Amino acid sequence: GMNNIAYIALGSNIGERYTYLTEAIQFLNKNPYIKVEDVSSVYETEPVGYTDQSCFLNLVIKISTNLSPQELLKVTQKVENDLGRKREIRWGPRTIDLDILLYNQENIEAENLIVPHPRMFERAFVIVPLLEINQDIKQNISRSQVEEMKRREGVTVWKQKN
């Protein structure tokens, strides 16, 4: 069994952005303890927090796993590492980011792991692709709240999922 469901957001704003994203999902999927169940469309998004840099490609995936939350976290960090994410980069451009957004319905408050992700409802580049693949959120947020945050933060479909 892989009884745990988790939602993960991916962003990239360096180089071949879509490649990093694509290789991130491939690396995750290659792990026998992770099954990728659904992937959002890919959105191009205006940089948040530090705007003097390239636009981002952002998506969100849903996975099934038998990994614990700390186990899942160490996998995503190994993936980040494999794709050349420099630990030191905080606000500027980076090859790849992985955020654990949701893990079942657990509320996690470890020193290194906060779930639900504390910024996810303040980021259109997370919420928009999340709603595409998570119907429980889809109701907890109006449809005009979704296209209203698209407009204000500058989030646009870059590649349709199929």
Ligand SMILES: CC1(C)Nc2nc(N)[nH]c(=O)c2N=C1C(=O)NCCN1CC[C@@H](SC[C@H]2O[C@@H](n3cnc4c(N)ncnc43)[C@H](O)[C@@H]2O)C[C@@H]1C(=O)O
């Ligand atoms: C510059 C900015 C804001 N601008 C953007 N603009 C657009 N348009 N699009 C973007 O995508 C975009 N991205 C941006 C951005 O900063 N992205 C990074 C998102 N993530 C990546 C993972 C963690 S890395 C550090 C520690 O976090 C701890 N940690 C705690 N909780 C969790 C958790 N739930 N999941 C993973 N790590 C966690 C670990 O223990 C690690 O040590 C935190 C970071 C975040 O959210 O701050």
